[PDB]
Amino acid sequence: MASFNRGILVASHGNFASGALMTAEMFVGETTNDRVRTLGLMPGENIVEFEHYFKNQVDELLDSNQEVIVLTDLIGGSPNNVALSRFLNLDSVDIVTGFNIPLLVELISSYDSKINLEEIVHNAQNSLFNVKQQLN
Amino acid sequence: MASFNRGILVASHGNFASGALMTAEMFVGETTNDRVRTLGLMPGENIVEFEHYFKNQVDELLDSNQEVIVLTDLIGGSPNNVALSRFLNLDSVDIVTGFNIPLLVELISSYDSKINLEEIVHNAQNSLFNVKQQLN
Numbered sequence: 001m002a003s004f005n006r007g008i009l010v011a012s013h014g015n016f017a018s019g020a021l022m023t024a025e026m027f028v029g030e031t032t033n034d035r036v037r038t039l040g041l042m043p044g045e046n047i048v049e050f051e052h053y054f055k056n057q058v059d060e061l062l063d064s065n066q067e068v069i070v071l072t073d074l075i076g077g078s079p080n081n082v083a084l085s086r087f088l089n090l091d092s093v094d095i096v097t098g099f100n101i102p103l104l105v106e107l108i109s110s111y112d113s114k115i116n117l118e119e120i121v122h123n124a125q126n127s128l129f130n131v132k133q134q135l136n
Numbered sequence: 137m138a139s140f141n142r143g144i145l146v147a148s149h150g151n152f153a154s155g156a157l158m159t160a161e162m163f164v165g166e167t168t169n170d171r172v173r174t175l176g177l178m179p180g181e182n183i184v185e186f187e188h189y190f191k192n193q194v195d196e197l198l199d200s201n202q203e204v205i206v207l208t209d210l211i212g213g214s215p216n217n218v219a220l221s222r223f224l225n226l227d228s229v230d231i232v233t234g235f236n237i238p239l240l241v242e243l244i245s246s247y248d249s250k251i252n253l254e255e256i257v258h259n260a261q262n263s264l265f266n267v268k269q270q271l272n
Contacts, residue, residue: 012159012237013159013162013163014155014158014159014161014162015151015154015155015158015159016155016156016158016159016237017155018151018155019150019151019152019153019154019155019156019158020152020155022150022151022152022155023148023149023150023151023152023209025150026149026150026179027149043162072267073159073236073237074236074237074238074241074263075263075265075267080267083267084267084268084271088268094266094268095266095267095268096264096265096266096267097263097264097265097267098236098237098238098260098263098264098265099236099264100209100210100234100235100236100264101148101152101209101210101234102210102234103264105210117266118266118269121264121265121266124234124264125261125262125264125265126261127210127211127233127234128232128233128234128235128236128239128257128260128261128264129211129232129233129234129257129261130230130231130232130253130254130257131208131211131216131219131220131231131232131233132220132224132230132231133254135220
């Protein structure tokens with residue numbers, strides 16, 4: 001079976017993650033399940049059920065990709081807490097929190113390529129900005 | 137009628153905007169239409185219809201708030217293009233692009249308060265980060 005370079009899991013409380021993917025696909029085209037997945041921790045769901053769904057999404061992406069980047073909505077959220085505890089020392093799994101559309105788009109566009117992740121992250125930070133201030 | 141401090145319009149291609157609000161409300165509680173709105177430019181919709189929906193959302197928020205912050209998904213997207221052209225020199229309307237959940241949450245939490253927007257933006261940039269790198 002194919003082992004691609006890099007899978008992406010986008011995870012959040014609520015609908016942030018699936019909505020981000022939907023929007024990203026408007027720019028980069030439809031993705032498939034062996035490369036990109038989302039997971040939302042919904043109102044009324046507990047972290048016990050969520051936890052193993054999460055673990056399963058990352059494990060399954062690793063069957064098809066050499067590495068996985070987990071994008072989470074914010075630091076100290078449950079998706080981020082779970083990701084860090086479950087995959088703390090697994091070097092093939094990266095965790096970037098506070099993601100925006102520019103990060104997600106760039107990671108999808110480059111997932112069959114070599115990347116510099118620090119540079120991608122740095123550019124995604126710089127993509128969040130006050131537009132009148134910056135355009136003068 | 138009440139003029140509050142600050143309204144928020146969250147705008148994007150697709151479902152990014154509504155999904156971001158839904159998620160933000162999991163942290164800060166349910167919002168109402170006179171303070172916070174979303175708008176998505178959907179597949180199959182043109183910028184001609186979208187444009188005036190957009191204008192109308194900002195105008196109506198200004199009936200109830202002294203200022204409005206428009207959050208858009210990315211620079212050079214149609215929501216951002218429209219916002220900048222329509223409200224270029226209206227000082228009561230700010231435009232911050234590349235938004236993430238930390239920005240949206242903070243702006244909702246502080247919308248009845250005096251703010252330092254530069255500081256909020258700077259902190260939102262710093263909220264997007266590689267968590268293993270930063271936690272060492």
